[PDB]
Paper text:
Rieske monooxygenases undertake complex catalysis integral to marine, terrestrial and human gut‐ecosystems. Group‐I to ‐IV Rieske monooxygenases accept aromatic substrates and have well‐characterised catalytic mechanisms. Nascent to our understanding are Group‐V members catalysing the oxidation/breakdown of quaternary ammonium substrates.
Phylogenetic analysis of Group V highlights a cysteine residue‐pair adjacent to the mononuclear Fe active site with no established role. Following our elucidation of the carnitine monooxygenase CntA structure, we probed the function of the cysteine pair Cys206/Cys209. Utilising biochemical and biophysical techniques, we found the cysteine residues do not play a structural role nor influence the electron transfer pathway, but rather are used in a nonstoichiometric role to ensure the catalytic iron centre remains in an Fe(II) state.
Numbering used by the authors:
A (entry chain A), B (entry chain A), C (entry chain A): 3 to 249, 254 to 371
The structure:
Amino acid sequence: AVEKLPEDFCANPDVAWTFPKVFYTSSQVFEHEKEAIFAKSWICVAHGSELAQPNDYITRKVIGENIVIIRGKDSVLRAFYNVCPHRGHELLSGSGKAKNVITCPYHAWTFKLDGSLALARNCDHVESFDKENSSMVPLKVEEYAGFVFINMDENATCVEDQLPGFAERLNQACGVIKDLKLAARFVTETPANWKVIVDNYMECYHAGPAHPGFADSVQVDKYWHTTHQNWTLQYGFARSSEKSFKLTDPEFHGFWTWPCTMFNVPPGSNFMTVIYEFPVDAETTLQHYDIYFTNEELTQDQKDLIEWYRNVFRPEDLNLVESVQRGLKSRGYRGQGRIMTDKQRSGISEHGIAYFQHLVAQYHQ
Amino acid sequence: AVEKLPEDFCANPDVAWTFPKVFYTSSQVFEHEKEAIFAKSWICVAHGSELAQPNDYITRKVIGENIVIIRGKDSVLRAFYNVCPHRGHELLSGSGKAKNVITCPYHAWTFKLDGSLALARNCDHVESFDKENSSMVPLKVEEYAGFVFINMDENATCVEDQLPGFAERLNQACGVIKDLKLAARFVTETPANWKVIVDNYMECYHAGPAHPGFADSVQVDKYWHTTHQNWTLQYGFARSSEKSFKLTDPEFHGFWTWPCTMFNVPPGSNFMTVIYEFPVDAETTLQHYDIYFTNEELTQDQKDLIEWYRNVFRPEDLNLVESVQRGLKSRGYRGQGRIMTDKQRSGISEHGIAYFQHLVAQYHQ
Amino acid sequence: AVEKLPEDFCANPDVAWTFPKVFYTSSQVFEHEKEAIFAKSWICVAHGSELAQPNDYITRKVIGENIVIIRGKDSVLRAFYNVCPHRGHELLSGSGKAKNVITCPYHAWTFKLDGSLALARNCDHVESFDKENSSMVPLKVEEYAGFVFINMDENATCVEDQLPGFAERLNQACGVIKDLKLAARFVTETPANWKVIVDNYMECYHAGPAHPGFADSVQVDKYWHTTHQNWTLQYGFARSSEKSFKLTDPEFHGFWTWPCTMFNVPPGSNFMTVIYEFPVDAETTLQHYDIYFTNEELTQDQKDLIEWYRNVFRPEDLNLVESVQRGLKSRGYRGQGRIMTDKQRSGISEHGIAYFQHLVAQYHQ
Ligand SMILES: C[N+](C)(C)C[C@H](O)CC(=O)O
Ligand SMILES: C[N+](C)(C)C[C@H](O)CC(=O)O
Ligand SMILES: C[N+](C)(C)C[C@H](O)CC(=O)O
Ligand code: FES
Ligand code: FES
Ligand code: FES
Ligand SMILES: [Fe+3]
Ligand SMILES: [Fe+3]
Ligand SMILES: [Fe+3]
């Protein structure tokens, strides 16, 4: 039988438990989430800076789809499936400046940067060849909140419909987003269900016992997790730390947005880090951890901070979700886990997980 | 349809064939054996020495279950699933001395060494929190014959009920078991069904043509394979060998015990080797090959003997079961293989396989 | 439901599309092709030279079957499944000179080079032992066109019935086949469905934009693709090239033969290259690329030509089929691809793919 959840699941965060374990492991559940969620939701893939000039392009992979996003020669941003309409060879790789046409490496069909077939050698001698039905196949792309979202659902509306108020709130958290520049990217294929990874972001319960240096800057004594409409916001005061961030009143901002992209405006509010979750299968999630600074020339504090994120901070969260994925298959882990919400909605309250899982639940009725 | 065997399968070792090949490869058969056998049988995991002191612990993995076995501060031996009752993080890794409490690396819940939840930060502010239903989840553990068995079946009786007479017989084979100390462990994930591996132990037919040095010490001319009640015993005379064991009348003892742990009391009778089979899936078996000596300081003969087991002896049996697993999927291997039992029950008689497979058969009615 | 194709599929190459994508990826489709095609078709495995002397043997692996082909002491060529009739251990490995008997490494049963059981130790003391039903299990083998084919279907006729006229045509393309000697073998497990790989051979559309040096010798301006009866022939003029073949009127011959072996008689017509496709699963194909020269002592031109094939030529075709396999799973690749046939049947016409896929289609009614 299809694994279905009650609509009220996690509707009361004061008395709630995570999903039954079959939702973090089941291949059947993933195929449903893959199609009902990730193929019909707006997926954040990059900061605007990576696509701000004509011919700039990037490629991404999410739920088995190789996607190209490319700023046309006409400065129009478009996105395409990265597969040739003739025999299915891939078209571009990596990121960079596209040439003025896209030439498929197999049979050298050409496409304008708008996906239109330009020249397909010998096509005028092939009977009934359909040039207009031989273009690159597009999908939707939207620049929102200074970032770039794709949608595989032709009928999708816009990213504001999916995250009402988010751009408005993020621009109050960070006023320099348009100026940010990608400083560093950690790519990691992570053996954990995408929802386990959102779980791990939605709470600060684990800060003290898992993250020394971070918990020393970001004071979770003054910390609140507000829920909204398909996103939430964690904010807290902070001070200079020699185990994380160093050097008036520093602040921390942590937005989770549906389905699984998270935006961080750490202390100082002049830079961002962004976690991108690109699910592969039920126990596999590709993660981008991006560090953005407004200056292209990095200071040492920024580079050192980068290495701190790579070697110290991120490995503690990688190690955590990977062990959780292993443990929740054990017959000793009885089904579900308790979400440690408190009435006060304290800094260590886990109520964030319940808002998230209640939304997920609506895709399993 | 479910693959079922006749109850008389291999009930007459004089005229018997191994399982139809689907029993060494089928994923469906493994899931049944995993649940009907390995989750309801006593599984040997270690010698008593590894758990003789308060706070000593070991971890094992069998049929997808990470297990912790730990001698309490109160000297009581217990075993637990190695997963935290809160979010499912794993609790301990490796082996060693546990601290006085078990602290989960994720959210720092604490547990006494008896599994009881000690302190779960913020729990007194979570509504309806169930502290007694938040302890580590236990399973059964028993010290028998100087070794340690776990059972995932709450209702299990004891290891003597599963191997009647075995401790009695093993203590006559080796009188120094309580004094043994783990001298060396070879860990190998082996691409062979667990039953293929028992198959390879249950006969001496292959000694001559596969194991020069061993067959030169253990004379299989004076060799008998006795069956009992869920175990069997292979014993034979031996002499000093410069290709295996060197330096009144040396003896060899080889006990197979249900489902798949084997105890060896090689010539001299003052040490043991033990094969532990921890099945992973239908074509995958984790193996521990343990060498135990009563002295902690190894002589060179013992260390050299260890290396002999690692580099010479064990690889010949690893290579054998791995090729068999490959070969029995071939359409040229017609279904089953003949068990070369002789009327005399000679040293090279394969009748041991039939006793084993007849017992396995009782789980496929 | 079973994926079935119309019998007329690709019967009109002027208006045709490749298979719906499920035929290059489906596990169910592969199991059918594996059994309805590869277990009932003649499979080319080697040149005659590798098996021309008594006791010469080779092993191959195709669709999960380890096969031994061995020239008896009596000079009779035979083929066997490479698995022992007793316990299923593999019998021979690699290629070389077999001893006068085949001794199984496990229990030392012996077999004459004709598969007959010779001596099975202790067999005269095993009740009802069936020596005649304990021989190596054979399959059909045929030397045709100077090469060696196996057939897993006991009832198969001969290779000429499956490729009428092929030996006759190949001997007109190359008159020195009996003199060829294996100069080099590239083994590659390729992540592409076997049909994708045949696809890539059946056309010259991609020569210009994917293979500089080759397209500079083999002029595809004078190039024709003739279809026949379960094989096709691509031939073209050529000239000396410093980017492929160097140094009266050079010719190129390229035979595809059912199901997926291809024979090349490149310019000069004094050597051959042969592609052997041994499918593993729906997205996996083992490939042998063999270079044959009539001299055992290689000149430098020949060795340099070999390295050209290894490092330059073959990687461009490996990279192509591997990207195609990735791309055709994308939801952006809409189902099928157009086969760029022209009325003229030009050198770049893709009509070859349609002949091939029409034959494949007959196995999915
Ligand atoms: C939201 N919070 C603070 C729990 C997680 C961190 O923001 C993770 C991160 O900054 O990369
Ligand atoms: C029982 N017997 C002798 C066949 C197998 C060997 O005991 C294997 C071993 O000693 O490790
Ligand atoms: C038939 N053709 C020329 C398209 C493919 C090439 O023969 C491939 C090869 O020579 O290895
Ligand atoms: S697959 Fe792109 S041009 Fe042929
Ligand atoms: S998972 Fe163990 S304390 Fe939270
Ligand atoms: S498996 Fe070949 S002799 Fe036993
Ligand atoms: Fe964290
Ligand atoms: Fe052995
Ligand atoms: Fe090519």
